[PDB]
């Protein structure tokens, strides 16, 4: 705290409470007692705990029928209008698409749709496999995800 | 019809004004006027201005008929205090409270 280390009054004599800094945390406009610093809130996850979780989420998504496997999910033009349609016939509104290829046409077409997320089968995570109502995976993508979780 | 006149930030202290207000509480407004006229206080000159204004506030706006008016409510609140400094002996300083007040006369037929 910006201030001087001058003791505000003397220690004895004046009938005030004893103080020794204008920046003490008892005082107004000086000092947080245990002040924050920027910290790392990351946690360590074991790989067999991370892979055991994802194997246990994908096992539960076929239990509550929220995993739907497709064999291809592409869209011809990189247009949000077509994908907005690609999911009405599929009867989807809040969905996570997980593909194996690098489809940038499909990737842009869901960049504006809020409840639709497109991944690349390598960045699927805990919170994304849970916070979407349906998870739709292309058949080339579920081959890779089965592999990395052994 | 209750007719209010106020005098806000009256420069007399509220305890000094409340002494004069208890003289004209409930009196008929003609008898209340010459109680305040032969009362030798500074608050008597202040309160009489509000009562003479509530007398005209009644007969100009709400109606007429001075002679059946009565000082029904009369109450003095404490306004904001102006804080001043009196220097005392041996470097010491004190706080002077220039105490304002809020005089409210409610006249009523």
């Amino acid at each position: 705290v910006t201030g001087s280390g001058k003791k505000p009054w003397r220690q004895k004599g004046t009938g005030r409470a004893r103080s020794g800094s204008i920046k003490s945390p008892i005082w107004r406009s000086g000092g947080v007692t245990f002040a924050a610093r920027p910290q790392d809130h990351s946690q360590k996850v074991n790989k067999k705990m991370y892979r055991g979780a994802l194997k246990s989420i994908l096992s539960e998504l076929v239990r509550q029928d929220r995993l739907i496997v497709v064999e291809k999910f592409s869209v011809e033009a990189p247009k949000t209008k077509l994908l907005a349609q690609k999911l009405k016939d599929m009867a989807l509104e809040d969905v996570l698409i997980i593909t194996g290829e690098l489809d940038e046409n499909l990737f842009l077409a869901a960049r504006n749709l809020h409840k639709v997320d497109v991944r690349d089968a390598t960045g699927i995570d805990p919170v994304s496999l849970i916070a979407f109502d349906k998870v739709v995976m292309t058949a080339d993508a579920v081959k890779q995800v089965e592999e990395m979780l052994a | 019809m209750e007719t209010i006149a106020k005098h806000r930030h009256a420069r007399s202290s509220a305890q000094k004004v409340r002494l004069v207000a208890d003289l004209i509480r409930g009196k008929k407004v003609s008898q209340a006027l010459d109680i305040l006229t032969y009362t030798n206080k500074k608050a008597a000159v202040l309160v009489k201005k509000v009562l003479e204004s509530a007398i005209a506030n009644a007969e100009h706006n709400d109606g007429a008929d001075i002679d059946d008016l009565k000082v029904t409510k009369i109450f003095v609140d404490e306004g904001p205090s102006m804080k001043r400094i009196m220097p005392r002996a041996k470097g010491r300083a004190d706080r002077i409270l220039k105490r304002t007040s809020h005089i409210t006369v409610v006249v009523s037929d």
Binding site: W9, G13, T14, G15 | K83, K90, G91, R92
Partner: peptide
Amino acid sequence: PNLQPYFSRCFSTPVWISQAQGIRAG
């Protein structure tokens, strides 16, 4: 002028250094 531009704190403490008579022993 009903504007109220008041003043502030305008000096510190002179002395609390004060009288000291009174003992029970020396």
